[PDB]
Structure formats: structure tokens, C-alpha cells
Design a protein around this ligand. Structure first.
Ligand SMILES: [Cl-]
Ligand SMILES: [Cl-]
Ligand SMILES: [Cl-]
Ligand SMILES: [Cl-]
Lengths: 241, 249, 247, 240, 242, 241
């Protein structure tokens, strides 16, 4: 391979410059098969990668794993092989009561509750998505009869205390995060997930385009524990046309 | 008045819910006069305000002054009078070599090199513009045949050291900011100005819509301050009025 | 002009090395007129400037606007034209219960609730006024039969949440500032204003002298905003201090 | 399942209270098979889990994935199923000239170059391993004829800039990490890896025991079976 | 004793409300003996205490030890016994070339390169001396024919790396402090010492008066390692008590 | 002298490479006299230093004063004279109900509630004791029939507010430390003291070995003096054997 973790070479990508980057390795083949000629590339650690064709254009589909650290490896190594655009498709918990399970959120920018973003820029830098890519995501939603929620997401390095979940072994949340969900609710933040702050900060600072769409699987105003994929594919087609 | 600084009452706004917020009180009249029935409202401190009508709907035009602190007062007090959308029109210094003087920049989000944004949200929160408003600014640029630069802006509480200017009395920049311009350049940041981080943070956290367009007056890869040699087109002021019309249509 | 914002040249200052720097452009003429031969210099943006003479010595009077950012421009550009001493005169809200409306506060040092001071020094550096200029302010108060309150001021980048005002559209204050007024009260801080932390930090680190006197316009233990029920001028004091310093 | 990510129930663990937690899911089977009656349990996302028996006592082997975030989910969910002791066995890059390929590092504590640790304690708190478990790791090394290097590890949320790698697309390292490798070298830091600050901070603050032993696979300045055999030996010591 | 560390009771102070607080326990007697009826009170740990009388009024003289932590104990426990004014007399290294060995510096405020100040207020709060007490220190200097240096001091929790000294076992200074002495020089900072940031922040926030005068024993523009400050602090105390 | 504060030269130490560093200068002689041929070296400020012999090997006993700052001077200056190992024996207040008066605490690592540690490394670096020295302390405890509590200590630059003490003139604790004792209790922290964060961080970063043992004489939630000093001497012997 020509990269350290992913097991890929540039030739395997057939000129792809755009990647769809789900968190879950098990979702990669499913996404690839929404496109044409889905082709296995590699699987190592949490990084499963496929190639497929979106209206004739090559697209890499590669899992990131959960969290900014594993995401940062995948993004860098794909960029080493010529990828310059990264479309995340994920799952998310809504924190606003008006967002329903099954809805779609397009993240414009993220609250940086991660560590890896700080390995690309100091905190003052905004974890903002690429405008053109966000625009394509919104258009793809509307083409499908979905009005997405568009706004700010809290992007956390933990699933449990950093999303102010209390149904845990200790039931404690450290002072920094105690009360934090209500703070983000009051600031209009839509939802929590675990990769977008890293993704957006690393891509914005390194000259790559990023965007994120996620399906809502729980509403945190109700409970702690309970398609986006069709939209991300449609957005990829818009961007590669 | 109904508010403590601006000298305005709610009635003076005639139902306006959208403001155009230039930094310079002296720019307010010219912006207002691009619309219909421009009328002077008030002038107190750095806050000069006019009303005008865009395709029949009232728009308030109110300066902010330079910096987040004076901006924060104008935004809050306008919001107390019913304003929920704030379109900043500004001037800016570009830091990328081929962003020409006379170009326009639409700021999608800002590096928070300000203090006032922290009075609305901790640093981790993104100083991001409203999507619909940013979209309207981009569309207005394109209608006028200008492809804007769209990206991240460094929004500083100083003009001199925080923008790494050295042609100053002491010629020194404190450690935090020494080398910083190159850091933002390397990160693809387009430009510097002095109000958008506060504006965007305060609006996003309080439920208001904000956006920012600015004309480039100097390119920092060539000059610290523009002079008569600097390049001397489509104005940011015409663009922000066009964007307001789109939003209000 | 020879500076980018103020519209001034060195010649226009007629040798002045001391500036009186109110926040409000509309106050500049009034201050100038307490001195002799008041002369308009320029007005651009929030920066109105006059020249006048204090017992025969030239003094520039130049507004800063509200906030550290606009202050930082006026101070640097005035220093480029030879000013080395900056006497702020302002308005302020008191936070101790027996600091009355109409009283005067001489700020010795400030709590740095601003961003611009960090563009001159890291947070550990004290936002402290010049001792000789503070002393002159105190002497001027006492010459007028006013005992000033002398102490620490909280210098904020906002009027509303950073001063823990709640009578706002959202009625919310972010976590950092929730409970903060009480913290400053408990620490003996006298008052809030919006320019002194920047002023003092930038002047101390660049080799210039600064000081700040302000009139109390509201007491925050009683009211957020003064109204018609709310109860010697700071401007007369600052002029008297300038005379002491330039004699 | 009884937990949201791992796909496990408490009954599947047969009363296990100790977990061996490698980063790589593809390493789990190999560790499990060093013990008795190894049995595949589940695989979901980066979390592959097996059960095996160490001198008659059940031990869970569960991968974490790379990084503190995915590790934090695995540790919490294993703890919800009754696990109280977490032994990491990983790979690492050495940054001291005297730490040779083939040597073993036992991490006593970590430089917190991560974000997840802050979701358990503010930065002042030390990302320190459990003394008893560290002691068992050291004894297991020595039983194998290895004197381990025992010391501080830099635990980074990135592989590239946070380890001051310049062999990247942009070739840039943000100011925070510029010159940082030399700073850690000068402070005696032995190596970089990507999970121990989170693991140690979360375990210390939540009342669980953690330790970490890793094989040196590269030395930035200039074994695989050994490190896994050692962690299994340490587990047996702790369970005896 | 009425306090945890100093070994003092309120009665031992005979009504003293002002303390002179040198760093060095071994300097306390000398200072006390500049006043009347100097009396040894106690010695425990780094805290040696004497009483003396300045123009008829009792003054306590109590060492702090080096650093904010030990200072913070002495100040609090003296305040528990009724002390409300703390005049530090110290030694210091100058970092400006125009300040000579033997000169005196009156610290108006300090760069908070300490930890204990943060146990009284967040960093944004200024480590500033009391105006009246600083005024008395300046007046005492002038009465003695010395124009003091009046300004900002860098107050460090270390003698070695936090003062950017390199003549050490490792010869290294961590990144935060590398280059820092030049930063402070350029900002007009006069000198380094090790107690004033803590003293000033704790006193300002707790409602007590503090000031600091120190004699310059080295100039750091020349070397890392190489009195009338004591006569001056006593004279300042007299002014404040008159 | 060879060093500015302690008043020592290298020759005076007779080759000693290990120091026992109590806080209280008055404790120095008492520690020294548990060893052989106790010999006064110097006394300046809060720094009283003795030499004595532990199983034939020279050991320095030198007080630090209270707090990181004065400790940092003593450690550096002793290291300039060849000392490479620093064993603290101190006093402490316990904050866990199960830690009884009479018990012993061996501090493995510290919460950095100090300033001087930051003059050696940024906050991310762990204030961790040397493993071999900690191991010797634990063995010394057990040789004497004591099972020590081994864990994390909160190391504060103040006795009063930073230990969340309200028994003060003002009765106030600044926001940073309000509620902090409970936070440390919930994280398993055993006790407060005032030097170990500085000692551990400075020693780890400069290449020296440090450890810390303390007898519990009080507990914030609810003979020993002789025991803690006997233990540290026994640990020194293990280390110099
Ligand atoms: Cl969720
Ligand atoms: Cl500019
Ligand atoms: Cl006010
Ligand atoms: Cl010195």
C-alpha cells in the first residue's frame, strides 16, 4: 500500500477525488451499492473502503470509525491518494424538541468538543463546512422532498459524558459538561455527533472540501438511548457533474 | 428612546425586522439612499441610523462602529426593537495573494480573534453566518457578475498587532500574534476585519440571522495600509442591498 | 492624513504629547471648550478630534468609540503623532452599594474582560494605570472637593451579558458570566466600563502613560439602566489632571 | 444487547471482570486464542469481542478502535457489563534513541494530547495508570526476560500533526505541535500512541483499573507476539 | 495558638493591624530592631515573627518564606489575628538595563507568573497594590533621597525556568518561558521576584491593603547570579500609621 | 557556596545522590538522626540541610518550605550538586472516608493545582512519581505492617481556598475552587498537600526520580508522624542498596 493504515494505492481509486465517509465500516458496502459497479478496495482496522461510480464518476466510500482521531487518519491518507472532497454521512441525536427521529440534519458548522481539531488549528478557528458542499447537500434533500434542519452541531469526543448522558456506570458528568446540553439547546444547537468538528477543521485548514449530513436516531429531550445515505449520494452526483 | 444607546423607538422602524449594519456611521446615508424614501432616524455616539424601503418593506440601516463591543450594543438594541436579521457590509484586508483590491468577500465563518464573542458562547462554538443569508449574499454577488470569495475571515479586536501589522510606534507584536498572519494564510483564511466574529456568535446563539460581505481595500501580501498606489467596479454596498431584497421578497 | 483612521497629521497637534480620550465623539468639543483656543481637527468614523490648550500647553482631545478595538486604533495612531500620555474620561456603572450616582471613580487597574488587551500581552500581565497619572487624577479630585473612589474596575467587551444584564431580548447570560457580577463585587471591584483594560494594557506594554476617571451614571445594585428616577464632573477633573501633568 | 454499541449482554461475559483491550479488531482473536476456550462473541463497528479463560477465569477481549473517543465507548459499555479492569496492549512509536526495536514499554502515565480525557476530568488531573496493574505488567515483562521501559507516553488524538509528522499532503504542523516532539523527548517521554490518556483518565476518575503495555514498531529517531504474551501473563497475575 | 501555622495569638500582637512581611525569616529581627521595643514572638517553619512599636503603635514583622503558597498562609493567618495591611520588603533581580544593583523598586502591580493568585481570582483580575500604601512607599523613598523605580514586576513561582535562567542542571526552559524575559523587558517590566502576585491578588480580593518594595541584588542583563529597602518599608509603615 | 540559596558545595554531600525532602526545616534534624553520623550542612531561609548515612550510603536531608516555589529552588540546587533522587515525606489531609487517621498515603501522581509545575511542562504532562521509588515506598510500608493507600493526591498552591476551606477571614472561595473538593472526592483523590505536583513534574521532566509518602493525621470528612519518617528512611535504604 502507499499509505500507512488504509491499505490503498492511488491507482485503486481510478482517479476519484471525492469520498463519502460514514463512521461505520459495515455501512460502506451499503452506500457503495447505491452507486454503480461497487468494488471492494481494502479493509484494515476500522477502515473499510470501496470504489463505486456516481453518474459515471469514481467515488471512494471509506469508513472513519467513531471519533476525530480515527477520522483524521482516514482523511489524511485519502488526501494523499488525491481525494479533495469529503462528504460525511452519519447518525445523530437531536437536542431540539422540534427535530424528529428520522429527520435529516445538514451541519453547517460544529461546536468543537473534540481534541483532534486542535491538532489542525487553535480553538478560535471555526469548524465550518464547505459552502458549495453544504449547498449540494441541501439541494439533494429538497430534490427528495426533505427539508433538512441546517445549523450548528455539537461534535463530541465522547458518547457519554460529553453529550451529558447520565445513564452510565457512575452517573456522573465532570464539571465542564454538567449543564452543557441545556447551554447548547439555548444556543440553537441541533444535535450531537462525534466526527464533524475534526473533519471540518482539518479539511478547512488543509484546503479540502467537507460537508456532513446525518440521520436522527434519538431525541435527547425524550431519552438517552433509542435516508441520509440516499441524500449523500445525490449530493456527490451534484458535486461531480 | 426605547433603548439606551441608539436613540431609537420601535415606531421609528415602522416594522423593520432586517438591518443593514455597516461599521462606519458615515456610510449609512449612502446605503439608505440606494433604497426608497431614505430618512434619517438618529445619530448618537458611533450609531447613525436611517430607515428606507426595499421593494416596499422597511429596512433599518444602523452603523456598529469598529469592533465587537460597539457592535454588540447595536445588535442587542436593534433586536429589542424587533430586528431579527443583520446584514453586515464592511471593508477588509485580504491575506491571500490573488484576492485583489476591489474584490468582494462573503464571510461564511470567522476566526474568533475577539473578546465579545466569549460573552455569548465559549470559544468552541463556531462563529458561523446564517446559511440563508449567506446564500442571498452569494446570489447578489453573482447577479452583479462578481464571483465572490467565500470562506473564513480572521476577525480581530485590533487593527494593528492582532492583524500582525509592524509599521507601528514600537514595531512589535506580542507572542500570541507573532507569525499569526502566515498561520491564517496557510489555513486558507481570506481576510481580516473587526466585527464579524462577534456579530455571528451573538446572532447564532440568540436566534437571529447574520451575514457579512466586505470590499477588499488592501492586500496584506503587498501593503500594510493602502495608499494612492493601491488599485482603485461592483460595490459591497450595492450587493448587501440586493441581498436584503432577496431575503425580503 | 498621516494616519489611516483619525485623519490627522503631526502638525495638527501643535506639539501635543498628551491626549484626553473620551468614549463619545459628541463629548469631545465640550471637553475641548473647558480649555483655551479649542480647535476642530478632524472627524472620521467614531473619531472626533480637537486641539485645545491647558494652561498654555497643547492637548489633543480624541474620542475612542465604545470598546477596546476602536480604542486601540485611536491610541496607536495618536502615538504615531507623538502622544505618549492618554487620560481616559468616561461613564460607568457602579457595582458596590454605596458608590452613588454622580460620584467619580479613578481606576487604578482593571479586570481584563476584553479581547484587545490580549493583542498586547498575555492575560497574566496587569491592566494597570500609570502611577503618576493616577496620582494627578486623585489630586485633581481633591482640589475640587471630591474624594474619589480609587480601585479596580471590571472592563468588559459587552454592555449586556459581560456586565451580567438580564433585561435583554433573550434574558440569558452565557455560563462564563453567569454569577460574575457577584464575584467582582465580593472582590471589591467598584464598577464596570468598556475601554480601560485595553487602554491600560496597550499603554503599559508600549511605553505610554494612561489613566482613567469616570462618572457614575447607574448603580447596578439598584438598576440595570438608569432612568428618570435615578439621581463635580469627571471632565472637569480630567482637564485639571492634564494641567498638573503638563505644568 | 444490553449496551448500545458492543452488541453484548452481561450473560455473554460469564462473570468476567477483566478486559484486554487492543486497538485493532483484527488482533482480538489472536489474543483470545492464547487463553482457553476462546469464543467469538460479537463484532459491530470497530468493536470485535471474544471471551476466553485464563487459569479458569473468564476474560473479555474487546477492541477499542483508534483514539480516545471509540475507546471511551468500549470502556464504559464493558464497565456497564461488570468489567472493572482494562489492560491495553498496543503498538507504538518510540522517540528516545535508547528504546530499541524489540523493547517493551509499560506506560505509567500519559501526556494528555487528546480531547476525551477532558470529558472525565480537567487537564490538571494526571492520566495515570493503576499501580497494581502496572506492577503486574512489569512483573510479566520480567518473567519473559524483558526489562521494560517504564515511563511517560505522549497520547495524541492524531497520528500525523500531533506526533509532529511532516510526511503529509500539506506538510504543515499547527503552531501548538511545532517543535513538540523535541519538547517531549527532552522531558523523557518514551513514545507516542493514541488511546492511553483517555483510557487512564476515564478509569482513574470512574474507579476502574487500567494499564498499558505496547510493542515498539518504529523509532522516530533511528515483538508483536511478545507484547500480547505479556498482557495475557499480566492478566493471569491479576486474576490469581 | 489561634492559627494553624504561625504559632501566634491575637493578644501577642497587642492590637497590631499592620504587618511588615519579608520573605526571609532571618531578616525579621533586623527589621523589628529598627523600631522600638522589638520582641521575639514565635518561629515555626519559615514563619519567624516579632513585634515592635513604630511611633507608639504595634507592628508585627513576620516572614512569608519564598513563594505564593507560604505567603498565602502567613497573610491569611495574620489577617485572622486582625492584620489588614501587609507591606512586603524583598530582594529582586532587575531586568531593565537602567536599574542598578542597590536600587529600590516599588511594585505597583505584577505579572501573575504564579499559581496561588488563581486561588483568589481568575487571571483577568489585576495583581495590583493598594494605592495609599504604594504612595507611602514612594514617599518614604523620596524622603530618603532615592527616586524609586515604580512599575510592573514579573512575579514567578520559580527562581530558575520562570525567570528564564539557563545556568541549571538541564540548561533548558519549557516553551512557555522560552523567550519570556525579553517579552517582559519589551513591555517595560522592571524586575523579577516570587511573592508579590500572590500577595497583591489575595489582598485586593479579600479587602486588605498590600504594597511591595525590594532591593535590587542582580541585573539580569549582566548575569544570572550575583537593606535600604528595609529602612524604607519601616518609614512607609510610620507614614501609614501616623 | 556552589549554590545560591542552600549554601552548599558538592564536596559537602560526600557523594550523596539521594535526598529526603521534608517541608518543615525543624523536621530535618529528626529525620537525619534516624540515620548514622548525622552532620549539619547549612541553614539559610527555610532550607536546613543535613547529611547522614543510610546503610553506609550518604543521604542529604533538606527542607523545602511550604509550596512548589521554594521546593523548586531546593530540588534544582541539590541536583546541581549531584542529587538525582528526591523522596518527600510530608503531612496530609485525607478527603476519603475510608482513609483513617494512622493510615499512610503513597502518592503515585498529583492533580496540578499549583503554578510551579507549569514552569517545567504544560498542563497536559502528568505529575507522576517515579515507579521504582514509589515501589520502594510501598515495600517499606509493608515491611512495617502498613498497607498504604496508593493513588492520586490534589496538590494545591494554597492551604485555604484551593483546599476549599471556608474557615477563613472572608469565608469565600473563588469560583474555580467552589465545589472542587467534591469533584476530587468523586474522582478517587485521596488527600490534599502542597508540593508534590511541582516536585513530580520538575523531576520527571528534568530526568530525576521522585516519590512521596505521608501519614494521615486528620480527615476532612470525619506515632503516625514517627511512622511516615521511618518508612521514608527504609525506602531510601532499598533504593541505595
Ligand atoms: Cl446520539
Ligand atoms: Cl485591513
Ligand atoms: Cl454601566
Ligand atoms: Cl532574581
Amino acid at each position: 500500500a502507499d499509505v500507512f493504515h488504509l491499505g490503498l494505492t492511488k491507482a485503486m481509486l481510478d482517479g476519484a477525488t471525492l469520498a463519502i465517509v460514514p463512521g461505520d465500516p459495515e455501512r460502506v458496502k451499503r452506500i457503495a451499492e447505491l452507486m454503480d459497479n461497487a468494488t471492494f478496495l481494502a479493509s484494515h482496522r476500522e477502515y473499510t473502503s470501496y470504489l463505486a461510480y456516481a453518474d459515471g464518476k469514481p467515488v471512494v466510500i471509506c469508513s472513519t470509525g467513531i471519533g476525530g482521531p480515527s477520522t483524521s487518519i482516514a482523511v489524511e491518507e485519502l488526501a494523499q491518494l488525491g481525494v479533495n472532497t469529503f462528504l460525511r454521512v452519519g447518525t445523530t441525536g437531536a437536542i431540539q424538541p422540534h427535530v424528529n427521529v428520522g429527520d435529516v440534519i445538514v451541519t453547517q458548522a460544529s461546536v468543537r468538543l473534540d481534541g483532534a481539531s486542535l491538532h489542525f488549528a487553535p480553538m478560535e478557528f471555526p469548524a465550518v463546512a464547505n459552502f458549495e458542499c453544504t449547498t449540494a447537500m441541501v439541494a439533494a434533500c429538497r430534490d427528495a422532498g426533505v427539508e433538512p434542519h441546517i445549523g450548528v452541531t455539537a461534535s463530541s469526543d465522547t458518547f457519554y459524558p460529553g453529550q451529558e448522558r447520565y445513564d452510565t456506570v457512575t452517573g456522573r458528568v465532570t464539571r465542564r459538561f454538567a449543564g452543557s446540553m441545556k447551554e447548547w439547546q439555548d444556543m440553537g444547537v441541533l444535535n450531537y455527533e462525534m466526527e464533524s468538528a475534526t473533519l471540518f477543521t482539518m479539511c478547512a485548514t488543509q484546503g479540502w472540501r467537507a460537508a456532513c449530513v446525518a440521520g436522527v436516531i434519538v431525541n435527547r429531550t425524550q431519552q438517552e438511548i433509542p435516508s441520509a445515505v440516499s441524500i449523500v449520494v445525490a449530493a456527490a452526483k451534484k458535486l461531480l457533474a
